[PDB]
Amino acid sequence: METHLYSDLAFEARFADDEQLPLHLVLDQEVLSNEEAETLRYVYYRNVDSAGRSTGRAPGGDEDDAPASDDAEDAVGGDRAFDRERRTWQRACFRVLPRPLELLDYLRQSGLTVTLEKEQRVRMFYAVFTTLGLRCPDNRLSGAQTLHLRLVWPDGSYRDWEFLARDLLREEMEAN
Amino acid sequence: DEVARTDEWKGAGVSRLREVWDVQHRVRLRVLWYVNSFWRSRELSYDDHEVELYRALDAYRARIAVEYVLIRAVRDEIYAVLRRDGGALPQRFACHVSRNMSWRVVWELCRHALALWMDWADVRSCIIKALTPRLSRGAAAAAQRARRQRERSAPKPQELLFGPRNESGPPAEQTWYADVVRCVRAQVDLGVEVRAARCPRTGLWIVRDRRGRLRRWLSQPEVCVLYVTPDLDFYWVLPGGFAVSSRVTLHGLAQRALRDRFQNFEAVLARGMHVEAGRQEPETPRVSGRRLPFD
Amino acid sequence: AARRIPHFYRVRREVPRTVNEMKQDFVVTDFYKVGNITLYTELHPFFDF
Amino acid sequence: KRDEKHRHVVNVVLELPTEISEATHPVLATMLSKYTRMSSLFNDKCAFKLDLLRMVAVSRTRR
Amino acid sequence: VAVFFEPHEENVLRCPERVLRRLLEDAAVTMRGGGWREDVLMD
Amino acid sequence: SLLHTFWRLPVAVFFEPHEENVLRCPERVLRRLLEDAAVTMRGGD
Amino acid sequence: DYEETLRLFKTTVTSPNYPELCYLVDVLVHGNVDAFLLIRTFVARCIVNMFHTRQLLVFAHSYALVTLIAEHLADGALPPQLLFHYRNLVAVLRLVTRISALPGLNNGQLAEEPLSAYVNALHDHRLWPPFVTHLPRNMEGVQVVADRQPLNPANIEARHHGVSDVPRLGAMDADEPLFVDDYRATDDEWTLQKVFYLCLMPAMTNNRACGLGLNLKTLLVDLFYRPAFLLMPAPEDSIAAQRQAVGEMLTELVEDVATDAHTPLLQACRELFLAVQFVGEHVKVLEVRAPLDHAQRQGLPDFISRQHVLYNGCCVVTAPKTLIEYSLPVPFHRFYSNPTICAALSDDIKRYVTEFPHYHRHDGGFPLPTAFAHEYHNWLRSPFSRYSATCPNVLHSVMTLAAMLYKISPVSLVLQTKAHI
């Protein structure tokens, strides 16, 4: 749970420049296997706006909008395009808990107090705690914003999923 | 004395626990909300106008189609070149054949195989695996170097007699990826790795297992195979080694879409990695539940 | 699945026999002989290979 | 007009003989209102026939 | 004893016109039908 | 349908399947494969 | 001593003249207590007639019917000896569940589970009976799949008996929503059901049973949609008139088996008709995915056990003959894949077996479809099928199959070594 606290402080420190707010997640056997959880190297996230444009690219478009050319010597705008694409991903902190646990009981074993509307227990073989940043530049955030989650393992393989802001925030934002 | 942020973070605690699925409903994860997050103090506005969601869904649809449009491009190219040459196709892979065979039924089996491959092709097909290394950064420079080596003029006697070694050409054995479709019991194997070399006596292609054994599915009548080379040349081969040859064009897609869909990842320095590049890695820094933690 | 069951048998092709099934027809004494092909898989009492 | 809808759903969907009608069968009369609102599934007459059968059965039970 | 013709570069296989027209009509069907998989996923 | 051939005469085969590929199959097997694939393919707003 | 009852069970489950009406009653009742209570009088007459005129105890093929007959028809509706046969069957199940656990040492619990669940898979809730009638109360770590993905609570729908439910009847052939009976199976009856289907049935039948589903939508429409049943009063003119009234299918199914000197054919068919309002849906096959317990998960923690079960179906011992058109054979388990029944019910399977006569055997060597053919991920593998193929039809064979289900985990090891087994 230290990862969530540190990430909250870090995002608070960076909010003036980044305009990204923190989002705390828990992962278990429903998203990754035990081996994948034991060998995880990095977690990366990307912000995508309502128009399908990634945050890290130029607002007015790029040379990348042009069609590809089938020329091996050109690759696909090779080095410059590779640099532009890599630039849009951002790295997040994470910690792995490799043994079966009950989440609420674990949180109460730490210093946290827990008070839910319904206190149903949730049991998981393992847990990965990570925090992702969601971008809100205008101090407004649109429900159509999309967020991507990437997990990377030592051999360089990766797995991607994407989420849209409505599912993440519908009742939570309406509550505030 | 003052109070630390960690103490109030602990005492304030959480009050939320919610399950969120991804857009395609493949994966479910839980979100925790802390009542002491700085998220609370901001003056935040939120709105979900319908047209923005509609546009977002259209963009998401566009993101998914990138692989399937490429597969369809390969298929319609196959049909176009087949129409262009009037259905007459030459042997390109080494295999012995007999004039007494009823080639009409193997034509019919080829048609069935085309239908089945189009039914089963996926993101893990040989096309995507073959083009993915092209997106790596070293790829463009390597292609420039290969072209400059390929077309240099013949050495004069001086350079043969004096100075450096002769510049080595490309290796004779190549690495290809293939999609294998079997009809008799419907089964398609996508993205299989194969080694291709050209026979000396006749300039045909010979394909081998990565362990060196000969791949034998030219001899099996019920299977057709699609090969893709790193130069993005593809062969659609029906048994007997007779093939349909064309190039995998991809100018129907923007650079951004292909690139951001499946550009390869590149690592950053972390625990256990040598600071020098290319060194032999030590053991992987696993964190495990079988053992006591090292501390 | 229930409707597709006839379609599986519609094609008259036999299927390979699984290795675990092949182990069952050796008698108690010739299981240990060199004629038992499957011995290279019998590594652990509690697990299958 | 509910008359045309009732006659259609009685003579085409249910395919009932002329001997049995809405006047003679109170269960059918009660069921007609529900069936009319479901204009689809009319190509699947078996669902309506089976539902009528089970409604008659539940009518005859001792409860 | 079975006898075979050994491989070469100039030996070709020819499609009869019936099979060719069947393939072409299948191509037209596939082109116009538009049963694209991304549509299925988004549906 | 019939293939054209460069070599005017055929040759016998003296090699095992693990070193050179040969397309050989009886006519009956070809017909059976054809019909089995035919039913399989179909088996697979 | 239950030798006589088990002998009669052996002779009835292997008889080729087992009346196919029982399968129809089984699929209609489908373990519903209210459905059985209405049908009770029909079952008593059917049992007495079928025992007297044919030397075999009837409705023995179904666990639910056997238990319901045992508990509900003990009031005096049956002669004492037949009731005692059914009581002996349920007592045999109790004896098996007595041997399966270790009562002298199975106190306590470990990681939320009874210590008995660690010892024998017969008590573990992750193992399902091959034929399922209700969902289990315990699903704490198990997923069930109907089409492609595990069923969420949103995808599970509750049946509504006794009221109009035509949209459900329209969806009978669909797969994504699963309709349940609003009951849930307790752990004890779950274990007893597993005993009946995994231990008793294959031991007595020697792998010659099979599962089938009935197209009961069309079947019931073709069977009961008559003026005789529609104009049922809140006419028994003559036998021939009743034959013409009920139709050929019903007069073949019911007449000599369920009618009586005090109950003509027409009112017997009317009695059968009253069960229709429960009906249920068509047959479907479900896949069960479950990681093992926290002791068996030490090695290979990513292993997911795959397991296939039959819903809305029934276990049959003979191929039905009157209901051939409406019957579908479902070979889904190495205990229930009898090639003879499948060949009788399906022409494609008949051609397949004709082409490959060696597949006709009953030792589990008959090829299952590729969907079901996951040998290594199943709980029961080849040795079970071989033993049930060779075993004699005696009480001991049941208990041997029960004891083969003892688990391998270290907890099971310490438990059963401490008992000096």
Nearest to A100 among G140, G294, G302 (CB): G294
Q: Which of B34, B46, B260 sits opposite A54 (nearest CB)?
A: B260
Among B82, B202, B241, beta carbon nearest to E23: B82
Q: Name all contacts of F12-17 with Cβ < 8 Å and 24+ positions apart.
A: F12/E1, F12/E2, F12/E3, F12/E4, F13/B96, F13/E2, F13/E3, F13/E4, F17/B216, F17/B219
C12–G351 C-beta distance less than 8 A: yes
Residues 6+ apart with CB under 8 A from C20: C48, G375, G376, G381, G382
HEC per residue, B137-187: CHHHHHHHHHHHHHCCCCCCHHHHHCCCCCCCCCCCCEEEEEEEEECCCCE
Q: Which of B260, B265, B266, B264 is nearest to B64 (CA)?
A: B260
Does C12 lie at the interface with B, CB-CB under 8 angstroms?
A: no
Give the number of C-alpha atoms closer than 13 A to the C-alpha of residue E34, restricted to the C-beta side: 3
| Structure tokens, G304 | 């997911």
Q: Is F26 on the interface with E (CB under 8 A)?
A: no
In three-state secondary structure terms, A35 is helix
User: C37 CA to chain B: closest CA distance, Å?
Assistant: 23
The single-letter code of the amino acid at A10 is A
Q: Taking Cα atoms as reference points, which of A125, A110, A114, A160 lies closest to residue A35?
A: A125
The partner residue sitting opposite E6, judged by closest CB among F1, F11, F24, is F11
3-state secondary structure chain G: CCHHHHHHHHHHHCCCCCCCHHHHHHHHHCCCHHHHHHHHHHHHHHHHHHHHHCCCCCCCCCHHHHHHHHHHHHHCCCCHHHHHHHHHHHHHHHHHHHHHCCCCCCCCEECCEECCCCCECCCCCCCCCCEECCEECCCCCCEEECCCCECCHHHEEECCCCCCCHHHHHHHHCCCCEEECCCEECHHHHHHHHHHHHHHHHHHHCCCEEEEEECHHHHHHHHHCCHHHHCCCCCCCCHHHHHHHHCHHHHHHHHHHHCECCECHHHHHHHHHHHHHCCCCCCEEEEEEECCCCCCCCCCCCCCEEEEEEECCEEECCCCCCCCCCEEEECCCCCECCHHHHHHHCHHHHHHHHHCHHHHCCCCCCCCCCCCCCCCCCCCCHHHHHHHHHCCCCHHHHHHHHHCCECCCHHHHHHHHHCCC
| Cα distance between residue A70 and residue B77, in whole Å | 15
Tokens of C27: 């008698």
In this complex, the residue of A34, A100, A123 whose CB is nearest that of residue G302 is: A34
Total residue count of chain F as it appears in this document: 45
DSSP letter at B93 equals B
- Could you give the CA distance from residue G324 to residue G136 in angstroms, rounded to a whole number? 32
Whole-number Å distance between alpha carbons of B15 and A113: 9
Contact: C10, G328; criterion CB under 8 Å: no
Name the residue in chain F with its Cα closest to that of B118. F41
Residues A160, B64: Cα–Cα separation, whole Å: 12
* Interchain contact A56–B (C-beta under 8 A): no
Alpha carbons F6 and E6: distance in angstroms, whole number: 9
Token digits for C5? 């069951």
From CA G235, how far away is CA G267, in angstroms rounded?
9
Angle between helices G80-100 and G187-194 (to 10 degrees): 100
Q: A93, A3 in Cβ contact below 8 A?
A: yes
Q: Is any Cβ of chain G less than 8 angstroms from the Cβ of C6?
A: yes
Cα–Cα distance between B28 and A30 in angstroms, integer?
A: 6
Residue B177: beta bridge partners?
A: B193, B228
Cβ atoms of A88 and A56 within 8 Å: the answer is yes
The single-letter code of the amino acid at C8 is F
Q: Contact at 8 Å (CB) between F23 and B101?
A: yes
Instruction: State the smallest CA–CA distance between residue B227 and chain C in angstroms.
Output: 28
Kindly state whether B186 is in contact with chain C, defined as any CB-CB distance less than 8 angstroms: no
In this complex, the chains that touch D, judged by 3 or more CB pairs closer than 8 A, are G
How far, in Å, CA of B243 to CA of B95, rounded? 12
B37 close to A8: Cβ distance less than 8 angstroms: yes
What separation in angstroms does the CA of G108 have from each of B51, G116, G140, G190, G418?
60, 9, 19, 21, 15
Residue G245 has a CB neighbour count (10 Å cut-off) of 19
Residue of F nearest to C6 (CA): F43
Q: Which residues of B touch C11 (CB under 8 A)?
A: 184-185
CB pairs under 8 A between C and G: 61
Q: How far is C35 from chain G (nearest CA, A)?
A: 20
> Letter for the amino acid at G112?
E
User: In angstroms, rounded to a whole number, what is the distance separating the alpha carbons of residues G339 and G319?
Assistant: 11
d(CA G204, CA G96): 14
d(CA D32, CA D11): 12
Within B14-83, strands assigned E span: 14-21, 28-34, 45-47
Judging by DSSP bridges, how do beta strands G178-180 and G156-158 pair with one another? parallel
Q: Rounded to 5 degrees, what angle do the CA atoms B255, B257, B258 make?
A: 70
Task: Report how far residue B196's alpha carbon sits from residue F22's, in angstroms, rounded to the nearest whole number.
Answer: 18
CB atoms near residue G321 (< 10 Å): 10
d(CA F25, nearest CA chain E) in Å: 11
What are the chain C neighbours of G407 within 8 Å (beta carbons)?
A: none
Spatial contact of A63 and B252, defined as CB atoms under 8 Å apart: no
CA distance, residue D6 to nearest chain G CA (Å): 17
Neighbours of chain A (3+ CB pairs under 8 A): B, G
Helix (H) or strand (E) holding A18: helix A2-18
CA atoms of B255 and B24, how far apart (whole Å)? 24
**CA separation for the pair E21, E33 (Å, rounded):** 18
DSSP state of B283: S
- Residue carrying the six token digits 């995998």: B248
- Cα B102 to Cα B108: distance, rounded to the nearest angstrom: 11
User: G405: closest CA among G138, G116, G205?
Assistant: G116
Do the Cβ atoms of F13 and E2 come within 8 Å?
Answer: yes
Q: Note whether A79 contacts G: Cβ–Cβ < 8 A.
A: no
- According to DSSP, residue B203 is labeled -
User: G282-306: b or e for each residue (b if 16 or more CB lie within 10 Å)?
Assistant: bbbbbbbbbbbbbbbbeeebeeebb
Q: Transcribe A139-151 into DSSP letters.
A: SEEETT-EEEEEE
SS3 D36: helix
Distance, in Å, from the CA atom of A62 to the CA atom of A82, rounded to the nearest integer, reads: 13
Contact assessment for residue A11 and residue A20, using Cβ atoms and an 8 Å cutoff: yes
Question: Are C10 and F39 within 8 A, CB to CB?
Answer: yes
Joined tokens for residue B262: 């499946």
Please name the residue of chain A whose CA is at the shortest distance from the CA of residue G141: A123
Using the beta-carbon criterion (under 8 Å), do A33 and G294 form an inter-chain contact?
no
Chain B adjacent subunits, 3+ CB pairs under 8 A? A, C, E, F
Structure tokens given for B189: 């194997």
Q: E19 — contact with chain B (CB < 8 Å)?
A: yes
Q: Copy the structure tokens of residue A11.
A: 């995002």
Q: Distance between CA G261 and CA G258 in Å, rounded?
A: 10
E43 has a chain F CB within 8 A of its CB: no
| Interface mutation vs chain B, best among E5, E22, E23, E25, most B CBs within 10 Å | E23
Query: Burial of G416 by CB count in 10 Å (0-12 exposed, 13-18 middle, 19+ buried)?
Result: middle
Q: How far is CA B114 from CA E27, G2, G320, G387, in A?
A: 11, 63, 42, 46
Please give the Cα distance from A168 to B132 (Å, whole number): 32
Phi, psi values for residue B96, rounded to 5°: -85, 145
User: Which residues on chain G are in Cβ contact (under 8 Å) with D53?
Assistant: 220-221, 224-225, 229-230, 276
Span between the terminal Cα atoms of chain B, in Å: 33
Phi, psi of B262 (to 5 degrees): -145, 55
Q: Give the separation between CA G208 and CA G13, rounded to whole angstroms.
A: 9
Question: Which residues from C are below 8 Å from B184, CB to CB?
Answer: 11, 13
Residues of F in contact with B101 (CB under 8 A): 23, 25, 30
Q: Chain F closest CA to B37's CA: distance in Å?
A: 49
The amino acid sitting at B17 is L
E strand or H helix that includes residue B247: strand B242-247
Q: Which residues of F touch C11 (CB under 8 A)?
A: 36, 39-40
Q: What tokens were used for A64?
A: 């990348």
Query: Which residue is it, tokens 């373990």?
Result: G31
DSSP secondary structure letter of residue B125:
S
Cα distances from G161 to residues A22, G18, G39, G271, in angstroms, run 50, 30, 16, 18
d(Cα G380, Cα G365) in Å, to the nearest integer?
14
CB B147, CB A89: distance < 8 Å: no
Nearest to C25 by CA among G389, G23, G93, B120: G389
* Number of alpha carbons in the 13 Å side-chain half-sphere of residue G96: 34
Structure tokens at D36: 């009319």
In sequence order, the 6+-apart residues with CB closer than 8 A to the CB of G63 are: G129, G131, G192, G193, G196, G197
Q: State the pairing for strand pair G284-290/G143-145.
A: antiparallel
Going by C-alpha positions, the residue among G277, G261, G270 that lies closest to residue G42 is: G270
The beta strands (E) that lie in A28-157 are given as: 42-48, 90-92, 94-97, 101-102, 123-124, 127-135, 140-142, 146-152
Quote the CA–CA distance of G95 and G116 in Å, as a whole number.
Answer: 16
Smallest CA–CA distance, residue B294 to chain E, in Å, is 46
B93 beta partners: B205
In the block, residue with structure tokens 């596939």: E30
CA distance F10 to chain E (A): 4
Helices (H), D9-44: 26-36
Tokens standing for residue A69: 């050319």
Alpha helices in chain C (DSSP H): 5-10, 19-22
How far is the C-alpha of G145 from the C-alpha of G148, rounded, in Å? 6
Structure tokens at A150: 């990437």
Substitution target from D54, D58, D60, D63 for chain G, most G beta carbons within 10 A:
D54
Residues in chain B closer than 8 A to F37 (CB atoms):
109, 112, 183-184, 222
CA distance A167 to A151: 21
Using alpha carbons only, give the angle G256, G257, G260 rounded to the nearest 5 degrees: 70
Burial G148-176 (b: 16+ CB within 10 A, else e): eeebeeeeeeeeebeebbbebbbbbeeee
CB-nearest to G346 from C4, C6, C18 is: C6
Nearest to B111 among E13, E22, E37 (CB): E22
Place of tokens 């089409």: G147
Whether B20 and A168 lie within 8 Å, measured CB to CB: yes
* Distance of alpha carbon C25 from alpha carbon G386, whole angstroms: 9
With vertex at residue G53, the alpha carbon angle to CA G52 and CA G54, rounded to the nearest 5 degrees, is: 95
What residues contact A10, with CB distance under 8 A and at least 6 apart? none
What is the three-state SS of chain E?
Answer: CCEEECCCCCCEEECCHHHHHHHHHHHHHHHHHCCCHHHHHHC
In this complex, the chains that touch C, judged by 3 or more CB pairs closer than 8 A, are B, F, G
Q: Can you tell me the distance from the alpha carbon of G235 to that of G244, in angstroms, rounded to the nearest whole number?
A: 12
Report CA B169 to chain centroid distance, whole Å: 26
| C7 interaction partners in chain F (CB closer than 8 Å) | 39-40, 43
Contact G99, G193 (CB under 8 A): no
8-state DSSP, A114:
B
Q: How big is the A-G interface in CB pairs under 8 Å?
A: 11
Q: What residues form DSSP beta bridges with G136?
A: G185
State both tokens at A166: 């409505």
Yes or no: say if G303 and C48 are a contact pair by the CB < 8 Å rule.
no
